[PDB]
Design a protein around this ligand. Structure first.
Ligand SMILES: C[C@H]1C[C@@H]2[C@@H](C[C@]1(O)CC(=O)O)C(C)(C)CCC2(C)C
Length: 133
């Protein structure tokens, strides 16, 4: 019952500061424009100890599965090859990606009826809000 309140299908409703986040990550111009335009559906499910997160959009359809605290290799939608670890910290899903000596942290939390996604790369944060689909 670890992630019950995250499970379901969620649709993007707002984004702020996201182009600047992606710049900080090192995403190139054309990918920033098309990815920034994406309006993903995020599908979160749990089966035993395995969490699956899918992001479906006109840009890319991506899927990760993982166990909390257990690192994995991830290919991001912008083609970074990263080492990822996802944990639950005080009810917040915390996703850290490491690559090329860089690090970004993506936090997902339930707030009211929303799923709020905070994306941080150095001093740049972007806040994205999802609603139930
Ligand atoms: C951290 C951020 C990364 C970002 C994806 C979105 C997202 O995961 C945040 C979110 O879930 O809304 C996106 C736009 C679907 C594809 C391109 C990236 C760079 C991999």
């Amino acid at each position: 019952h670890m992630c019950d309140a995250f499970v379901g299908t969620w649709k993007l409703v707002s984004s702020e500061n996201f182009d600047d986040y992606m710049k900080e990550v090192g995403v190139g111009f054309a990918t920033r424009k098309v990815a920034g335009m994406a309006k993903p559906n995020m599908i979160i499910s749990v089966n035993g100890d395995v969490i699956t997160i899918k992001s479906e959009s006109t840009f890319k359809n991506t899927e990760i599965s993982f166990i909390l605290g257990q690192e994995f290799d991830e290919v991001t939608a912008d083609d970074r090859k990263v080492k990822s670890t996802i944990t639950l910290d005080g009810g917040v899903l915390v996703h850290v990606q490491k690559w090329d000596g860089k690090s970004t942290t993506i936090k997902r939390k339930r707030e009211d009826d929303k799923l709020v996604v905070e994306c941080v790369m150095k001093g740049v944060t972007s806040t994205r809000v999802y609603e139930r689909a």
